[PDB]
Design a protein around this nucleic acid. Structure first.
Lengths: 75, 138, 63, 146, 101, 151, 186
RNA sequence: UCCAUUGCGACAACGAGCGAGACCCCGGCCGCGGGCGCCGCGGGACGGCCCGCGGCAGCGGGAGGACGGCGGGGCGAUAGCAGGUCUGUGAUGCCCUCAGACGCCCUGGGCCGCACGCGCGCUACACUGGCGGGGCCAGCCGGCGCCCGCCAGGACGCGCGGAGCCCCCGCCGUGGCCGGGACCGCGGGCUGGAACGCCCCCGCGCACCAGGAAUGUCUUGUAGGCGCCCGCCCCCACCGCG
């Protein structure tokens, strides 16, 4: 009765999620976490690093909902 | 005025970063351990909660100015209600000791010089706080 | 088979014993001008376009 | 991330998800008087996976619990402020909670009192709500020796 | 003339009675530099009692309200002049006149 | 807070030329206009500054429907007291819109320009009679009663 | 271009003649808080903007009752998501969804005399719009209990799938279910 | 025809009346005097007018318009009930106890005991939710300061002053959970002749993961949601009037 609470070793697991993020055109902060087996707290952090990379573009900014689509996803 | 134009959230957060370089106030240890309020569910996790409260009191102070705000007055800006009881909740005050330290410490830095019913900003402080706002908007 | 668009030429009376139903006199918006009273629930006014009908069921004006 | 799930201490498993804070109040609950007044800070990280926490950080944490006054935690956070024993202010840990509960209940029986009868007979003590409120489970004044 | 400032305050249940006493104080004071009358916000005295003496019935409640209106008149005069004004003012029994030096 | 002489009590001298009242849900906003350099600030606070950021777009309705040349240059100082939060914004909106109308003043067909604003938003020039109702004996709220045990 | 500075209200068109006068997309203030006392009169869906009518519908369930503002936010995040789901005008997806989620066929009992067996009744062309804005929102609400998906995207799931004649949303599977009740109880 | 013998017509009935109306209380708005406390006195939406029907009374659709044809309230006929209260009383009949008193004072009880069953309530079941600091906002109509103490509170004083929800950015995975807040150990106090009253701090994490029959209560500032004040009261609200 569970998913994958945290346990985000940043090796191949972390590389698979951002490649999955390279596969999905648009991403939702709660949605990715259950889209790819992980908790919500992990979901915002990698995307923020993608925002630091400039590979993530935000459209709505709120404490409840933050949405990201890859700047280079059109490739 | 630009101090009414700096959004309250932006003013308060930005002011405390240089107040950290300033070394003004000096938040004590027991206060950073205790949970603010007599109705709060558990302690705020801000860690620099005392320093962040200090940017909160002196901004609302600029608007209050001459009329003055006593120890209860700044507690009023952050007044909350208990969220965990079988019976309904009646509103109550926040903690007096933490608030009494924040403007008493501010009296020490001479930005606030007060001698009236409770507390008022020294003109040098009103000008300087307003000057931080002058930097904030433009 | 498609819900036939209809023109509510006029509203008749509220019946069904709870007043809930409001049977109305109707005419075909699409068709050779077939016009018959039909049973309607919810608010209706004249010149309404009712595109929710099979046409065969026929209602009546006695109430 | 070396999340390191389990890392059980005090005979109570923890989690790789729990933040370093809930991990102690969640040490069976029993054994941690919480509200995180000192727990929120201690010397440990505020919000990280609790297994990732290094043993050295965990060991210092074990020491602060072992001597609360030495950490600088005020007496009001600790549970046994005056003590009916050697009268010395002390914290309560997991095993001592139920030993001290035996101490509180068995003392109650030896020193017979209304507060003991309202526990040996299983009546709720203090509230006097054994009248018309708790049909709930049958933990209400019943009786039937004969 | 030691022109003392007197504040005259009138509290009364009836608006009809109050206006008449207010008019007399204004009328008497034109010779003495009377400041115009100040009308108070109505002072509500609501008492709510369930009407039934016994407990029978859906308790219905009597809201019994007494309205107090107070009138402030500032006068700068000698101590005697208010007394001369007093004979002329029409005294309504039970209405209160308050002389505040 | 409540119908005081707070209409102009805060400001002394610099008599602001226009006085226009806006009221929604027990919230009083008197609009003071001096025809300056595009100061639409109300409550001594910027138009962009608001309690609900999303709500600000509604309070810019005369600005979008009526010519911007009006709001391009004006001067404002509004005393809003009373109201929960959103009550204050519509009252503010009634005030400023009436304040722009008071500025038009001399043109006789001032109403015709204003009615484009009524057509897009009715009550932008009108005050609602909607006010809180009262409870009665046996009723927890204004239009209810204690749940009845037997029909 | 007046919807959240985007999604022009003018661009939206009446795709269906089934309900036309009742859908109003002509007078919307950007982010339609629209608190405007539309309770008097029995015939004014023009007065209640459809998006704001949905706003009223979204607050519900007792805990969120009264929170019209939490709906204005709910519509905006879903509309961005709809724009991200399909480059089309999200308000147009709303016109299609409300038309495609309200019941074409319902059957009340309508026993004029005694025995009551549900009798087939064509719905009023105003009635369909009211239920559609109710069912779409309730589609998100029905699955807003322990769902990982937040309410806003829950609504965005409902409007887009049911927008065409395809049925995946609870709201449209309700219209098809009640249509079937009125095909059986004819 | 109207909520209504509410009318208009017509009639061995013809005139009266009492209910309903009228009236009064508060708002929808404005004007005059004023004013500290915006508060006293007037007026004003009249089914008036438009269109359709109306014997006519009325009747819809309408526009102007603060407001559409009672604002939110009170006062409420004749006739009853073997309804309730002798336990509010200088409202009291009959009848009892009249000093080892059913008189009247003190001291300790009890109504706070008490399977199950109920008759209202209250808080929950979380994800439009938490819990987060931190932008706040009232209307009843209300006083604050300073200093110690986590608070609880206490001292020393001066007469003086405002909610929550929500809105903020955050922290947070669907875990009886950081949901919920029970039960209940350990202290700090309050006030009171006295806690057995209460609050705060720190344990603790009850049930409960959307409620079967069978029920209620309500159409706009309404339902719900969320707080303030009072009544009583040393103490103490979930109650009630607001």
């Amino acid at each position: 009765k569970v998913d994958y609470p945290t346990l985000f070793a940043d090796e191949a697991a972390m590389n698979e999620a951002l490649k999955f993020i390279k596969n999905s055109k648009c991403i939702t902060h709660t949605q990715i976490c259950e889209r790819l087996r992980v908790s919500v707290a992990l979901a915002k952090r990698v995307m923020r690093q993608l925002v630091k990379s400039g590979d993530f573009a935000i459209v709505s900014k709120s404490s409840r909902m933050t949405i990201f689509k890859n700047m280079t996803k059109k490739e | 005025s630009s101090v009414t134009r700096v959004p309250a959230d932006v003013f308060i957060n930005s002011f405390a970063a240089h107040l950290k370089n300033r070394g003004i106030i000096k938040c004590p240890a027991f206060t950073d351990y205790v949970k603010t309020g007599v109705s709060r569910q558990y302690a705020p996790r801000d860690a620099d909660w005392f320093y962040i409260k200090a940017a909160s009191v002196i901004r609302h102070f600029y608007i209050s100015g001459s009329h003055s705000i006593g120890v209860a007055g700044l507690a009023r800006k952050y007044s909350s209600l208990q969220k965990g009881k079988t019976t309904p909740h009646h509103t109550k005050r926040a903690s007096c000791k933490v608030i009494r330290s924040i403007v008493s410490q501010f009296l020490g830095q001479k930005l606030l010089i007060a001698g009236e019913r409770g507390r008022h900003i020294s003109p040098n402080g009103r000008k300087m706080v307003e000057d931080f706002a002058e930097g904030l908007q433009k | 088979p498609e819900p036939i668009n209809a023109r509510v030429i006029e509203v008749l009376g509220r019946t069904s014993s709870r007043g809930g139903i409001t049977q109305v006199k109707v005419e075909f918006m699409t068709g050779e001008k077939r016009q018959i009273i039909r049973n309607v629930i919810g608010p209706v006014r004249k010149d309404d376009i009712l595109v929710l009908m099979e046409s065969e069921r026929e209602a009546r004006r006695l109430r | 991330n070396d999340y390191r799930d389990l890392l059980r201490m005090f005979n109570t498993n923890i989690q790789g998800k729990v933040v370093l804070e809930c991990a102690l109040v969640g040490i069976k609950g029993i054994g941690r008087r919480f509200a995180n007044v000192a727990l929120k800070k201690a010397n440990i990280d505020v919000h990280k996976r609790a297994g990732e926490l290094t043993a050295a950080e965990e060991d210092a944490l074990m020491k602060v619990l072992e001597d609360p006054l030495s950490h600088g935690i005020p007496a009001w956070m600790l549970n046994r402020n005056n003590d009916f024993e050697s009268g010395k202010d002390m914290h309560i840990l997991v095993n001592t909670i139920a030993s001290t509960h035996r101490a509180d209940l068995e003392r109650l029986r030896k020193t017979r009192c209304e507060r003991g009868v309202r526990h040996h007979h299983n009546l709720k003590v203090r509230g006097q709500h054994t009248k018309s409120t708790g049909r709930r489970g049958h933990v209400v004044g019943v009786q039937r020796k004969k | 003339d030691m022109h003392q400032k007197y504040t005259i305050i009138v509290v009364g249940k009836d608006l009809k009675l109050v206006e008449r006493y207010v008019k007399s104080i204004v009328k008497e004071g034109r010779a003495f530099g009377i400041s115009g009358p100040c009308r108070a916000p109505v002072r509500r005295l609501t008492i709510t009692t369930r009407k039934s003496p016994c407990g029978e019935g859906t308790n219905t409640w009597h809201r019994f309200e007494l309205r107090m209106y107070k009138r402030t008149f500032w006068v700068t005069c000698g101590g005697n002049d208010i007394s001369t004004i007093l004979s002329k003012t029409v005294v309504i029994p039970g209405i209160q006149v308050t002389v505040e030096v | 807070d409540l119908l005081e002489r707070n209409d102009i009590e805060v400001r002394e001298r610099d008599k602001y030329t226009v006085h226009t009242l806006g009221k929604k849900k027990n919230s009083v906003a008197v609009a003071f206009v001096k025809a300056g350099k595009g100061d639409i600030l109300v409550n001594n606070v910027p138009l962009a500054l608001v309690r609900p950021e999303i709500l600000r777009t509604k309070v810019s309705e005369p600005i979008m429907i009526l010519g911007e040349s009006l709001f391009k240059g004006l001067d404002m100082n509004i005393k809003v007291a009373g109201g929960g939060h959103v009550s204050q914004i519509y009252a503010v909106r009634q005030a400023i819109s009436r304040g722009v109308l008071a500025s038009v003043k001399d043109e006789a067909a001032r109403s015709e320009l204003r009615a484009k604003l009524v057509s897009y938003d009715r009550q932008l020039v009108v005050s609602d009679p909607r006010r809180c109702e009262a409870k009665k004996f046996g009723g927890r709220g204004a239009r209810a009663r204690r749940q009845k045990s037997y029909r | 271009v007046a919807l959240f500075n985007k999604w022009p209200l003018t661009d939206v068109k009446c795709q269906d003649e089934s309900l036309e006068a009742y859908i109003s997309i002509d007078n919307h203030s950007f982010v339609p808080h629209s608190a405007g006392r539309w309770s008097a009169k029995r015939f004014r869906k023009a007065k209640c903007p459809v998006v704001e009518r949905l706003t009223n519908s979204l607050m519900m369930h007792g805990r969120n009752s009264g929170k019209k503002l939490m709906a204005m936010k709910t519509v905006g995040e879903a509309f961005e998501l709809i724009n991200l789901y399909t480059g089309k005008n999200p308000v147009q997806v709303l016109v299609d969804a409300v038309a495609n989620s309200g019941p074409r066929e319902d059957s009340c009992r309508i026993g004029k005399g005694g025995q009551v067996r549900r009798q087939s009744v064509d719905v009023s062309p105003l009635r369909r719009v009211n239920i559609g804005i109710y069912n779409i929102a309730t589609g998100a609400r029905k699955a807003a209990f322990r769902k990982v998906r937040p309410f806003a995207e829950c609504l965005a799931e409902e409007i887009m799938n049911a927008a065409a004649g395809a049925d995946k949303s609870y709201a449209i599977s309700q219209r098809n279910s009640v249509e079937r009740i009125a095909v059986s109880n004819r």
